[PDB]
Amino acid sequence: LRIHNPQIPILLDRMDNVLFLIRVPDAVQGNVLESLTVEFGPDTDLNSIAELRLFYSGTEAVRRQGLRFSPVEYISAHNVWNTRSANPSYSVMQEQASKIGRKVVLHSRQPMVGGINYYWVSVRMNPDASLLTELRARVSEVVVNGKKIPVAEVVRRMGYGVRHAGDDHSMAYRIPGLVTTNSGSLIGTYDVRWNSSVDLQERIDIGVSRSTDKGQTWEPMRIAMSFADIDGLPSGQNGVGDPAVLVDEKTGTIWVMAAWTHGMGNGRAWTNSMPGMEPMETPQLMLARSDDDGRTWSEPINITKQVKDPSWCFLLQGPGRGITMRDGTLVFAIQFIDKDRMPHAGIIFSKDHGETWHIHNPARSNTTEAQVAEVEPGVLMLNMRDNRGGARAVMTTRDLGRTWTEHVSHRTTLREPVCMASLIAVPAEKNVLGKDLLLFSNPDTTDGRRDITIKASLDGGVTWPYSLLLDEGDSWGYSCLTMIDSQTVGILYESSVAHITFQAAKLKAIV
Numbered sequence: 001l002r003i004h005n006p007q008i009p010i011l012l013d014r015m016d017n018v019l020f021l022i023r024v025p026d027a028v029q030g031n032v033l034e035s036l037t038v039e040f041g042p043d044t045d046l047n048s049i050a051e052l053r054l055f056y057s058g059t060e061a062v063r064r065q066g067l068r069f070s071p072v073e074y075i076s077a078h079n080v081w082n083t084r085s086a087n088p089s090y091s092v093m094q095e096q097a098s099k100i101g102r103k104v105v106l107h108s109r110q111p112m113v114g115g116i117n118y119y120w121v122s123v124r125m126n127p128d129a130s131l132l133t134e135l136r137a138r139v140s141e142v143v144v145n146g147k148k149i150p151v152a153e154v155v156r157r158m159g160y161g162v163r164h165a166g167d168d169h170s171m172a173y174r175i176p177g178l179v180t181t182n183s184g185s186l187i188g189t190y191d192v193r194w195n196s197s198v199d200l201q202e203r204i205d206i207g208v209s210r211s212t213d214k215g216q217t218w219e220p221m222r223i224a225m226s227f228a229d230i231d232g233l234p235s236g237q238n239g240v241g242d243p244a245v246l247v248d249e250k251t252g253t254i255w256v257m258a259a260w261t262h263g264m265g266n267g268r269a270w271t272n273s274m275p276g277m278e279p280m281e282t283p284q285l286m287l288a289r290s291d292d293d294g295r296t297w298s299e300p301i302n303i304t305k306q307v308k309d310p311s312w313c314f315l316l317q318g319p320g321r322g323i324t325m326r327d328g329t330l331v332f333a334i335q336f337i338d339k340d341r342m343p344h345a346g347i348i349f350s351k352d353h354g355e356t357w358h359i360h361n362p363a364r365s366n367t368t369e370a371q372v373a374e375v376e377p378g379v380l381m382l383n384m385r386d387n388r389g390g391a392r393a394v395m396t397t398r399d400l401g402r403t404w405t406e407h408v409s410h411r412t413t414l415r416e417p418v419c420m421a422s423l424i425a426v427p428a429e430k431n432v433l434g435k436d437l438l439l440f441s442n443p444d445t446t447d448g449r450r451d452i453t454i455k456a457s458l459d460g461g462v463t464w465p466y467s468l469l470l471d472e473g474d475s476w477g478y479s480c481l482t483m484i485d486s487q488t489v490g491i492l493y494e495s496s497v498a499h500i501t502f503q504a505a506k507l508k509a510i511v
Contacts, residue, residue, distance in 0.1 A: 009159030015085040021069035022119040029114035041136030048129035053096035054106035057118035080166025161498030172197035178492035200269040204239035246322030254290040259316035273314035313337040333370040345370040360401035373425040449477030
């Protein structure tokens with residue numbers, strides 16, 4: 001008998017969350033799993049827990065290869081009819097408890113099938129529980145047919161599903177970006193993929209979720225940018241996506257940069273984009289600004305003619321977030337497909353608070369999505385998705401992209417499955433550790449998007465000896481980081497439990 005505690009976020013806004021997965025390998029037909037006791041750690045706040053229920057799932061398919069802790073996904077992150085509770089057709093509730101003591105006993109009575117039997121324990125939190133709650137629990141005993149068969153450290157963390165599949169009648173949400181305003185508000189940005197999860201071209205708008213209480217609650221979604229019916233073309237041929245967001249820091253202005261595709265049938269923009277300058281010729285590089293803390297958004301500003309070389313097939317921002325430099329320069333990461341269809345990553349910047357923008361030179365060939373951070377005063381570090389595979393490319397520039405210098409961590413220190421990644425810099429004076437800090441988040445693998453992990457470095461990205469695993473499950477993998485306050489990191493990412501998941505974690509739990 002085995003018990004697995006999955007390292008996945010426990011969502012405050014869910015009615016079910018997988019706490020324990022239980023596989024009974026070779027049961028005797030008719031034997032009853034009579035009781036099961038879960039024991040919470042001494043420091044666990046029991047007032048934060050609303051409910052605990054035991055579920056009996058069925059048996060297993062005979063040809064399913066390997067040790068498995070479930071026959072199917074119990075709680076869907078894609079079923080637009082229910083992403084918040086367990087699918088009743090996969091799990092049969094055996095008992096549920098609302099009086100949560102230090103120990104909670106759950107009973108079943110189910111006769112049980114010969115061979116593999118699946119059980120699991122769900123936990124529902126109070127919707128107002130602290131997002132910094134750490135939940136330590138274990139199955140202290142299991143009783144099967146009168147016997148206390150043996151059972152044989154996982155720290156669970158909370159989250160909030162800022163966007164679920166089907167929310168507000170949108171099939172999917174993707175490409176998260178996250179920043180903190182000058183007033184302490186959190187701005188979450190993302191694709192609103194209405195008809196499906198497919199990339200541009202399609203009906204896609206830029207959505208914004210705003211929180212003023214460090215992520216405990218999120219205000220209803222706002223459409224910060226849309227071109228639904230610009231020239232009478234279908235909104236499905238007027239999509240805008242892959243947003244990047246930044247805060248000016250001196251002005252307080254919030255900027256969102258996104259790529260608007262016009263026409264293009266129902267094909268993919270990455271391969272159908274062609275050179276030129278006009279909207280019908282090539283995708284447009286668009287900006288939208290908010291000067292009231294993200295509540296209201298301006299009409300789109302088209303900066304294509306400012307920075308796009310006519311020979312490029314495609315110019316777009318690097319999705320996620322941008323930065324303000326110490327000297328006031330606003331900087332986004334950008335990527336462009338050149339005339340030969342070779343992609344390059346770079347940076348776009350403005351020295352006049354967003355009124356005008358400039359691009360110098362590409363950092364590296366055959367790279368796409370990137371994020372930029374100021375490791376040292378006047379030194380920008382570009383961390384790039386590299387098509388060669390296996391590892392992030394890392395380069396630094398002191399002249400805003402005129403010349404680029406390889407970093408020692410380049411193609412070495414940060415593995416990836418070729419996926420978007422987030423990088424931010426936190427000055428010593430702005431965090432509880434009192435040291436210059438880099439924070440990095442991506443799927444910590446070389447193959448497959450899973451194991452979303454925050455990594456920290458105390459020596460400018462040469463070494464990353466601190467990490468925090470957030471999500472075991474498979475996901476679409478994109479993520480974005482910000483500092484909530486001096487003590488806590490916030491991450492908005494595509495998880496195995498919600499299309500757009502927010503989590504907060506104490507800096508001291510990582511370092």
